[model samples]
Target chain A: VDCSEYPKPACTREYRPLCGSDNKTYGNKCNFCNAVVESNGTLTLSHFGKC
Target chain B: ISGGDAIYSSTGRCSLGFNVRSGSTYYFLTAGHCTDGATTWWANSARTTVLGTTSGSSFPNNDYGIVRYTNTTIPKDGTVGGQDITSAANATVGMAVTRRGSTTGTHSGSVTALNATVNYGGGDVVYGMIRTNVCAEPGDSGGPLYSGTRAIGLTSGGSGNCSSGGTTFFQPVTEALSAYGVSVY
Candidate 1:
């Protein structure tokens, strides 16, 4: 199933690897610690919510 | 007491009378409910002169009133000289609240909730009311609820007075401005 539009849409019961990552991990299974990092090992994360 | 009156309703928060939009005469801003369905009525203090009832009003969706005065006497808030009536400040929980009226004169309390809804007996209900723990009395309706000099809301209703603690509600003036297609200032 496609998770591109999650919450609004249902996804496959099983986790699948992200399309482009070479890592052995699946994008669907990724957690807070597994987000992608830049070539210099920098991570990009953003915070959002109602003020 | 057109000049001295502070008219209120069941709840102490009051719609205060004042000059609005550059008229030499008196005008008032109060809870829309207080002025509902009446063309005019005397404020508790000044019974001789009409307080101008519900010339224009909005409720539930918006809470506001524009009371016109026909009397020669002016409505004065004592500190008008030093007082600066302005839009609501950025309100948050625990902020101190105060009100002035013909009955209670001046009183203090604290902000309890920012966004609230209230039903005042009858079918007259209001949304987005600002809840406070302050006590108010009858004849204080339409009085200003303030944090410092910034205006927060107009008296909508409450439970008790300064004696026994009660829950007070106010109509956010900003929402009322939107209902009347006016600027929040």
Candidate 2:
């Protein structure tokens, strides 16, 4: 969960949703990775649509 | 009819919220955004069957709306996607939950964050949201977000599509019930 090295991800209008290991849903991979970056990489993909 | 029931509005195909009761009168909760789009709601997009009428709306600050049942013949007191909702409680971080929307059927996730906030741009902001799930499709707005028998959230908004999965959020069902002075049977 190293926030610094990952920098930040950019988001697009893409409609793919991802459930995180943290169980929170992000709008897209960008937001998920951004959250993953925010979580210091602790948040990982759980499943699709939702957990 | 009940939570996760199919309802339609000018906002497009709507995901219905859990049914509630106020003694003799009956209603359901939904996203204020859906209620804001149209006053009348129907069981289908064809506009043939009447579902209910808008009675209350609270968006921006909150994201839940109330609709009074105009057609009382339809059965009440039901479950969301087969999970019998016995009560509603405040969602806690890490609590497992499920959401059933017309768009995606049943989706399970857990509350990773409580009292989260998000802005949908255009000043459409909401507070005290339950952050869970991969995504909340637009058509799924106002659906049930529950855990076992406990009603937890009213589908508010989310970030992605069911096609690929993304992030989503919800309005605490506790507040919606409290604010409207309603409850599940």
Candidate 3:
């Protein structure tokens, strides 16, 4: 995965975890975007934690 | 990840506490009891994806371990699940926090006491724990306890389960980090 192709979105420091389609939890929405991009757009938000 | 994620050991399921590093080498923190069960760890229970190997483990008097990353292919992002863990701090009484583990995912609670202690049956007595009302299960051992983005503690042991509400204890992240000369981002 060429991370250069997708610049990571600047995300605030938040503790909300988002479960990804691949069962990996992204630290936040911005991290999820980075995951989706790194996966070449094959991933999706799978609903994460409440807090 | 910030933490509260699953990692497998030959002993069974356990959760990741936080990512730490020294120089260029990366490692993760977890319950020493869980680390005692295996030398190697996997991202999945099937053991296809190698995560790391045990570098050090300390239980009883304390409850923390360091797993050195043997698999550099994995991203070493400093966050728990999707939450970014910016720093590590000592837990204070009445501090609200969330714990992420494989068995019960994420559970919210508040620190009930500082310098708490727990006796997990035989040969696993631990002291200086962070007592909380957060629910945790068997597989959640070694999970992360955090207040928002701040890293706090590592799951040690406690009574009850997530099913009927549980009380749990954790080892301070600072001690674990200091013991092995590692630091969080």
Local distance difference test values of all predictions, in order: 0.51, 0.75, 0.77
Candidate 3 deviant stretches above 4 angstroms: A1-51
lDDT of 3 by residue, B91-126 (tens): 998899999987778899999999876655334467
Q: Which ten residues in a row have the lowest lDDT in candidate 3 chain A?
A: A7-16
Candidate of highest DockQ? 2
- The DockQ score of candidate 2 comes to 0.05
| DockQ (Cα-based) for each candidate | 0.01, 0.05, 0.02
Tens digit of per-residue lDDT, candidate 1, span A1-51: 222221211111111223333332322322211233212233322321111
Which 10 residues in a row give candidate 1 chain B its minimum summed lDDT? B3-12
Model 1 alpha-carbon miss at residue B118, Å: 1.4
Ranking by DockQ: 2, 3, 1
| Residue B34 displacement (Å), model 3 | 0.6
lDDT, candidate 3, at A49:
49
lDDT tens per residue, model 1, B1-185: 32214553222224363334333444556656556554655555335544554568776455667765565554444232245665545557898977665556667788899777665423545667788887665555666777666766776665545766667777776665555544322
DockQ for candidate 1: 0.01
Q: Model 2 over residues B1-185: C-alpha lDDT tens digits? A: 67887777764566788988888899988878778757888887588888889999998779888999898677765578667888889899889988888767788878889888777654667889888864655457788898889999888766656677767788898998999999986
Candidate with maximal lDDT:
3
